Amino acid sequence: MKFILAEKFTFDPLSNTLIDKEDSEEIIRLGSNESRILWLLAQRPNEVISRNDLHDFVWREQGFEVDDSSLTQAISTLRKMLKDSTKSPQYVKTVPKRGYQLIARVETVE
Template sequence: MHRIFMYEFRVNGSAVFSPKDNLLVNQQLGRALPLAPVASRLLLFLCCHPNLIVKRRDIFRAVWEDFGFEVSQGSINQTIFVLRSALDDAGVGADCIRTIPRIGYCLLAGVERITHETCGAA
């Protein structure tokens, strides 16, 4: 038997992000917000690097290029805009993603990784 770990992230103690389901949920507010796959990949990348400045180049690589996409600077700006809106709607706050001019972005939030362990046959 082997163990399969699935991760979710609690952001600022108020919302749970499920990368597997592309979903941002705030149970207290009764809101479940679906995210586009690209917005979900970006939030996953930011959740894996909370409170750290991540360079635009690293975001492009992890969110688009590793998935076979080549995009412009406008794509990251638009995705950040969409993600800020979703975080605000989920009660986390749009201001938790800070723009670091000419460098990148920083997710200023408490991020807790939640592990769900299941058992499966080997």
């Protein structure tokens, strides 16, 4: 289960690797939390997801107990690693009081 995002990135959650079409050799390392965040965004391409849903699905599976702002820190790190401008979002959008959005094109190879 590997994804293509916005016709530019290749995302591997089983290996938590991010690959660029511009930089195929360069594979960037994303933490578990960011990988699970993007994985749920891909599992629901462009339908609005809820902050409780993300905190649950990410940290209820591993039994971790963290505060709500940890989700905000995870999204901030994902934004800095995706080189996505928060002012003009192209990959991840913040829908206030509803959660987040994956506006980029998502394709499922296999």
